[PDB]
Amino acid sequence: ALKLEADRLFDVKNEDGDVIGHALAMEGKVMKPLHVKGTIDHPVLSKLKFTKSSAYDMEFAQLPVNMRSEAFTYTSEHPEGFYNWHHGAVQYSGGRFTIPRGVGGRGDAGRPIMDNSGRVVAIVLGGADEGTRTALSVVTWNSKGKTIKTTPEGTEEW
Numbered sequence: 001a002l003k004l005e006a007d008r009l010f011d012v013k014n015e016d017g018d019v020i021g022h023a024l025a026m027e028g029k030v031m032k033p034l035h036v037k038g039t040i041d042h043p044v045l046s047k048l049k050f051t052k053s054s055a056y057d058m059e060f061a062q063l064p065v066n067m068r069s070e071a072f073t074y075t076s077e078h079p080e081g082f083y084n085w086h087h088g089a090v091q092y093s094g095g096r097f098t099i100p101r102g103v104g105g106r107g108d109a110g111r112p113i114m115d116n117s118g119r120v121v122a123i124v125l126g127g128a129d130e131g132t133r134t135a136l137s138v139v140t141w142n143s144k145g146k147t148i149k150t151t152p153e154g155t156e157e158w
Helices: none
Strands: 009-013 019-026 029-033 051-053 058-062 081-085 088-093 096-100 112-114 120-130 133-141 147-150
Touching: 019 120, 029 120, 096 120
Parallel strands: none
Antiparallel strands: 009 019, 019 029, 029 058, 051 058, 081 088, 081 112, 088 096, 096 133, 112 120, 120 133, 133 147
């Protein structure tokens, strides 16, 4: 089990070059959180014309015909239980995605949350610490393709 995967997750760096978030190829588009003001570290992607979507903290461009294959798949069905993400397990209960306190922060905006079949279930934007856990502020689409945005009280954008 070698982890040979397509180029789907890209970096977004700041003026001096600090990774401040992520951008992903999914469902024909390259998308990244609008609040992440940096450049996509990619010779092709960084030259695209990005359409803004303030209401959802999303910014997106059309994936070059070629790359359209190297992309994630979305899924609007997320039964309660555990999910996967860069830092480990993400729990989904009570309509909320949570991670342990002190784990998320700058650099995590734009990172997907996936299931065991490898489909994206959401995209992290920020988090609000509640007790021993952190409630994430994510973007998720419903069965009818409508973009939805969940933002807990006191969410700090990452």
